[PDB]
């Protein structure tokens, strides 16, 4: 019951109250100084006055393409163990098994020996994926 | 949750004051002045018990020297002789003997004198 109900050993760490005497933590308590740190927190960015690393280092080159359609990546080894009987592989089926993000286009990698002779109804297969699928005896789609 | 922090503090106040009783003026009346004195008093007790032990050695030595001089012998040669005799007797009870039974002290002096070799050469 509740009177036998206990917290887990090692959890429920007591709050270290700070400004409660010298035996508990101290009068200055961490801020054992008289400078800025004693009275206020200096921004983590500020180095001292010299140019911080944020301006000292050069700007990361390049840009970012707005029209970049990122594809989700499906492990053919995961196909091998997930559907050892083959038969048919749908995207709805793969997400039903939780192997890939929902509502997204996919790609197939070839890292893993494929033995399951199964056609895959999906998108954008790699050349090595075609090598493994045709090795098993299946067919690529898009 | 206001807690009214009086009670917890009062435990300290009444404890320190009841221990501090007997001190003169603003020592046995004021908490914050008494507190100072307990710190000084107890640091003093801390070193004074040890100094006390040394002090008692000084007293015992003086008395042994007095009785020894009454038997025409110095403390130096007295202890040297007793060590040569193996008489592992402390200065507390030796000084006691000096009062309870001076004759026993004289006997120990004769033992030391006989045990001492001959002179100051080696």
């Amino acid at each position: 019951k509740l009177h036998d109900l206990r917290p887990a050993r090692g959890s429920k760490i007591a709050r270290t109250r700070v400004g409660r005497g010298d035996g508990s933590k101290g009068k200055t308590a961490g801020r054992g100084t008289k400078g800025t740190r004693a009275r206020k927190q200096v921004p983590v960015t500020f180095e001292g006055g010299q140019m911080p690393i944020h301006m000292r280092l050069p700007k990361l080159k390049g840009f970012r393409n707005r029209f970049r359609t990122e594809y989700e990546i499906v492990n053919v080894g995961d196909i091998n163990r997930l559907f050892p009987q083959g038969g048919a592989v749908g995207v709805d089926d793969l997400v039903a098994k939780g192997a890939v993000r929902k509502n997204a286009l996919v790609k197939v990698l070839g890292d893993g020996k494929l033995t399951a002779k199964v056609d895959v109804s999906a998108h954008k297969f790699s050349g090595s994926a075609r090598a493994k699928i045709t090795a098993a005896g299946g067919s690529a789609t898009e | 949750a206001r807690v009214k922090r009086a009670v917890n503090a009062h435990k300290k106040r009444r404890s320190i004051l009841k221990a501090s009783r007997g001190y003169r003026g603003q020592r046995s009346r004021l908490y914050r002045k008494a507190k100072e004195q307990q710190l000084h008093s107890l640091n003093y007790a801390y070193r004074d018990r040890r100094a006390r032990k040394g002090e008692f050695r000084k007293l015992w030595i003086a008395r042994i020297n007095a009785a020894a001089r009454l038997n025409d012998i110095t403390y130096n040669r007295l202890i040297q002789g007793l060590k040569a005799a193996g008489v592992e007797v402390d200065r507390k009870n030796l000084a006691d003997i000096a009062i309870s039974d001076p004759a026993a002290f004289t006997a120990l002096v004769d033992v030391a004198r006989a045990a001492l070799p001959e002179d100051v050469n080696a």
Binding site: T45, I53, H54, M55, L57, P58, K59, L60 | -
Partner: protein, 62 residues
């Protein structure tokens, strides 16, 4: 209410697929007549963050 990422850090540092951060070196945008190809090759490329400020940088990015 919600953390902010330092925009310069997001525009200068690039996190990799693991717990590593790299810094672009480019002390080569002003004068390039006196610098040898040795020096420009030392600057060319991308260099892991030295371990002497990662405890700061990771908080600057996050």
């Amino acid at each position: 209410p919600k953390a902010k990422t330092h925009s310069g850090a997001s525009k200068r540092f690039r996190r990799t697929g693991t717990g590593k951060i790299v810094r672009q070196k480019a002390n080569r945008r002003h004068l390039l007549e006196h610098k040898p190809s040795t020096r420009t090759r030392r600057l060319d490329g991308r260099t892991v963050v030295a371990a002497n400020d990662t405890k700061r940088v990771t908080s600057l990015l996050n």
